[PDB]
């Protein structure tokens, strides 16, 4: 995942995979579950001042803020002419990571 | 040489020398003969610590056979000027100037190790030249002696006459004796 | 050994020596014998601080027994040349050159700690050689003596005649005595 | 010229000095004549190690021909004050001041190598001046000798009179003899 | 110690030495006795600044008490060779070599502080050996004296005979006198 | 000046000193006069190597004209204390102290170059003072001589009387002779 | 100290000292007495520059008052060995060895500043011992003198007899005189 | 100081000192007097180069006036022990110890500059003491002289008797003469 407007993958691509499991049904996709992995890698890499925009780091978190809380995302029709609208207000998002070094902070 | 230590922080590991590491903890070392150059380092450190936390105390470890009076006075004035209370701990020994700075700490925050000696004596000087210049320098040192006795009397709490008679010649005091005299307030034997 | 300090800033964390850290706050230390090398170093700091912000006052701490006049005049000229005011604070002692630079600060911004020894005396020199060369150097040092007396009289405010009589022999002035004499403006006892 | 070592950890490669690397293992080296500067360095290291782990023991290898009494007492007081038990290992030699610190370690943790010499002698001093000043200094050193003997008697377990008689003149002891005398309690022949 | 300063740039923050930072501004310091080692250092700085911008003038601060003529001549030739105009400012004092280099700057860009002193004298030398060698060295120094007088006359603008008469013995010149004599162009008393 | 070397590793690039690079390979250099400061550096290296890997041999290169006995014994005890075998290689020369450490290596790991000198002699010392003090130091030096002779016999395999007779005066032994005498095990002339 | 400059090279920004920055441009400085340590440093730089570009010209500034012939000869051999031409520029002074290296530059690439002094003299030496040893050293110094004279004639173009006759005693040659004598090719006054 | 150079490689740009830069190309510098400290430095470099590539020859530049025989022997043994061939090049001069190491290189890989000077002499020493101990040292120096001559004859190829006759007193050999004597294989005059 990466911030919008870059070569990297977009956050909306996550919902695209969900549609496939739901037979491309928006009603069924608006009540599914999602398990994000490697969430500990998007953490700021000792760049709190934000000298450069962490598209692969902080940039991913910013885009996911509205996704976890709930927002009508525009997912590609299949995988831009239609931009199917999928509401993520009732979709659960699980985040799994290793957080190597977090023990020192605690 | 001075060893290097690593401090663990949330951001990451950082390398600092042994003395710099203790500086972050508001600890200042006063070792060796007191002079203008070493005095400025102490003054700069004390001023730097005041800005970081003008409320937390500052610890000053005194271990030296005295030194120049002018250089020592700069530390004393800085110690009294800065709002933070400066706690003085005597390690090994504290000569005339070292003892003056030891007793110049905040009330109730002047400590000394169980096995340490405190020495106090009148200022030592000297000048060679014309008789007219001798009187000028002779009177100047006399004023310093009187001024230092007044300051020591105020901190120790004893009468000015007592300080003059006791400081007329070299006087050695132990840790328990320093407490009774008033140079220090307590003795640190073991960590509770 | 100069201890290192950590400065926390939004841009990041940077490590600087104790002296460099105070330099960022427009603080310059003048300690030890006054010479061309140390004096030249002070000149660079003043010029650097002026470029950064020629509006904030520059603080100069003087604690030295004096030195060559030529080196001192270099600092005095720089202080008067740069538009920002150069606040002078005396800690410890201030000899002829130290006192001359101490009184050379901006009017109303010259301070001294309560326990400070300010000393002022006429220039010292000496030459060996042919009588013709002795006369040349004798006139040169005399001109320097008169030039320094005029400058000191200007900052102190006292008449040139009084400065000459007081500068003929070594004169020691305490912090309160320096205020009334005009060398300093006020005394810094405690913060706020 | 000291060699550099690399420490491997999850954070990454870390560069260290031979002495700095051993400091992480709670190992302090006491070498050369005991003085205030080197003594303060050891005091800082002991305090630093206490903060990291006030439970783990510190290993202070002692190899020195002795030194200043005041400087040595600062180390002795620090070892007794800090909660951790300081283990002293004698390698090469341990003179009066060095032997005093060797026997100042925690009970059951004062080690000595098979080939090492321990020398215990009374304090050495000297003063030049008037008779009144000589008596003050002569009496002061006597108190140090008496105080030093009492501390050694407590750690070694010998009677005060026995220590005074043995320390009246230089007395050399070997690793096995030091065990019976009480300076140490074991010999490190081979690692087990 | 040489303080360190931080320079703000678009790429980021770069730490520069006090003297190194001023070098970026085309400012070179000439302090202390003139010798071959420092002379080559100044020559390297002048050459480096010329390549960076051969159209911007270079500022040279002179506060040296003079030195070797050969070492100084290297600086003089370098200043005249490089196309950029070298501006010389006298701080503190300027002896024979210092004065020669001070007046060697580009016409109209030579400045002297109000209290700076300038002294000019004939070359100093000597030799021990056979009479033939004495004549060889005696003639060489004489040529240097004549060559230096001609160069000084060209920059100062005074007659060759006048320079010779004034250079027979040390001649101290103040800032106002240097302007009249032609050694400097103006006096920098204030920023504006 | 010690040249720097780069160690290329899959993880990344790294820089090391000439001696530091060899330290990673369990190699220690013993050069110059033997003293407490240099001895501690060697002891620290041995302790560091033991902690890194206690199952790998340590190579020590000896090239020195000897030195203090206490400093040397501090290294001898460390070799036997640590379980890793300490291989000793003689380069250039190995004097009394150097020879003692050369023969102190693990059996079968004592090597010497074809062109190397080995000298063994009784301990050298001296003391001045009262007759009573002379006896104390005289008896101690004699005990050290006997103790060193016993250790030499154990490592070399020679009888006590033979070592005493050969050690009474300086005895120079070449590399081939050192093999028969037992000071070394083999001679390394070429790499196979 | 040596100032540090920054080069805005492609792909990054690096900070190098003034001397290192000029070395990257094929510029070598030869300052001070000629000795083995400084001579080897120059030889290393010349060999390094050959690797980067064995075709670009190399510049060597000469401002030395001479030195050991053996140390200087090492530089001369390197200059004539490496394929790149070596351009010698005389700045300030150039003694016998310095002048010898000045003439060792490639034909048409030997320059000299206007106010530069070149002094050429026969080798200086000395030995004390037995008459037999005196003859050995006396013959060697004479051979070295003849060898240097032959090299001087080859580079300068003067006849061998002329070089020997003019080298008997110190011979001072100015910049224009050096061109006529053949020591240098041209004089650099201003950039054209 | 030592200039710093940048090396371009696949990883990126790396900063190296002049000596460290040449160490990568298997080039070792032997400058100044031969002693134990510098000798060990060369030994460490030779061993380091052997591990990096035991099939590439090592170049050793010898420019020294001699030194301790034991220190030089450590380098000689290392050169013969390591499988890689060591190429010796004489720059400036090569005294007894330097000449011995110069001729100790691999046959056919020994070079000398055209103006280099090589001198060979018998070992020099001395001892002060009794008649019994002096005989030991006086007998050891002869053994070193004999062993030194044997090695010199083996590498040079001349008979042992001839070496003794030529080594009795100082003998200077030029670059061409060294070739006939066998000390060098060829002379390097230009790069082809």
From Swiss-Prot, chain A:
Quaternary structure note: Component of the ClpX-ClpP complex. Forms a hexameric ring that, in the presence of ATP, binds to fourteen ClpP subunits assembled into a disk-like structure with a central cavity, resembling the structure of eukaryotic proteasomes. Interacts with Mu phage DDE-recombinase A; this interaction remodels the viral transpososome for replication.
Top-level taxonomic group: Bacteria
Induction details: By heat shock. Part of the clpP-clpX operon, clpX can be expressed individually from its own promoter.
TM region(s), chain numbering: none
Protein name, as recorded: ATP-dependent Clp protease ATP-binding subunit ClpX
Similarity remark: Belongs to the ClpX chaperone family.
Organism ancestry: Bacteria, Pseudomonadati, Pseudomonadota, Gammaproteobacteria, Enterobacterales
Gene (name only): clpX
Shown stretch of the complete protein: 148 to 258 of 424
Phenotypic consequence of gene deletion: Delayed and decreased induction of the extracytoplasmic-stress response.
Protein's job: ATP-dependent specificity component of the Clp protease. Uses cycles of ATP binding and hydrolysis to unfold proteins and translocate them to the ClpP protease. It directs the protease to specific substrates both with and without the help of adapter proteins such as SspB. Participates in the final steps of RseA-sigma-E degradation, liberating sigma-E to induce the extracytoplasmic-stress response. It may bind to the lambda O substrate protein and present it to the ClpP protease in a form that can be recognized and readily hydrolyzed by ClpP.
From Swiss-Prot, chains B, C, D, E, F, G, H:
UniProt catalytic activity: Hydrolysis of proteins to small peptides in the presence of ATP and magnesium. alpha-casein is the usual test substrate. In the absence of ATP, only oligopeptides shorter than five residues are hydrolyzed (such as succinyl-Leu-Tyr-|-NHMec, and Leu-Tyr-Leu-|-Tyr-Trp, in which cleavage of the -Tyr-|-Leu- and -Tyr-|-Trp bonds also occurs)
Location relative to the cell: Cytoplasm
Pfam families xrefs: CLP_protease
Subunit composition and interactions: Fourteen ClpP subunits assemble into 2 heptameric rings which stack back to back to give a disk-like structure with a central cavity, resembling the structure of eukaryotic proteasomes. Component of the ClpAP and ClpXP complexes.
Function: Cleaves peptides in various proteins in a process that requires ATP hydrolysis. Has a chymotrypsin-like activity. Plays a major role in the degradation of misfolded proteins. May play the role of a master protease which is attracted to different substrates by different specificity factors such as ClpA or ClpX. Participates in the final steps of RseA-sigma-E degradation, liberating sigma-E to induce the extracytoplasmic-stress response. Degrades antitoxin MazE.
Entry note about domains: The N-terminus (residues 17-34) interact with ClpA and ClpX.
Protein's UniProt name: ATP-dependent Clp protease proteolytic subunit
């Amino acid at each position: 995942l990466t911030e919008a407007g870059y070569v990297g993958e977009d956050v909306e691509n996550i919902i695209q995979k969900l549609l496939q499991k739901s037979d491309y049904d928006v009603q069924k996709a608006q009540r599914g579950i999602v398990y994000i992995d490697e969430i500990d890698k998007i953490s700021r890499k000792s760049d709190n001042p934000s000298i450069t925009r962490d598209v692969s780091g902080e940039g991913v978190q910013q885009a996911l803020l509205k996704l976890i809380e709930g927002t009508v995302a525009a997912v590609p029709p299949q995988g831009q002419q239609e931009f199917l609208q999928v509401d993520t207000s009732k979709i659960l998002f699980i985040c799994g990571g290793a957080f190597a070094g977090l023990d020192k902070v605690i | 040489l001075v060893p290097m230590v690593i401090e663990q922080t949330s951001r990451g590991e950082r390398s600092f020398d042994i003395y710099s590491r203790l500086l972050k903890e508001r600890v200042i070392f006063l070792t060796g003969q007191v002079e203008d150059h070493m005095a400025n380092l102490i003054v700069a450190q004390m001023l730097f610590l005041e800005a970081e936390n003008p409320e937390k105390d500052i610890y000053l470890y005194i271990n030296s056979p005295g030194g120049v009076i002018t250089a020592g006075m700069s530390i004393y004035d800085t110690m009294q000027f800065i709002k933070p209370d400066v706690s003085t701990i005597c390690m090994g020994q504290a000569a005339s100037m070292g003892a003056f700075l030891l007793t110049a700490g905040a009330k109730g925050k002047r400590f000394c190790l169980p096995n340490s000696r405190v020495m106090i004596h009148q200022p030592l000087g000297g000048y060679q030249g014309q008789a007219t210049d001798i009187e000028i320098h002779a009177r100047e040192i006399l004023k310093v002696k009187g001024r230092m006795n007044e300051l020591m009397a105020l901190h120790t709490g004893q009468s000015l006459e007592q300080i003059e008679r006791d400081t007329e010649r070299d006087r050695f005091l132990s840790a328990p004796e320093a407490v009774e005299y008033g140079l220090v307030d307590s003795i640190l034997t073991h960590r509770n």
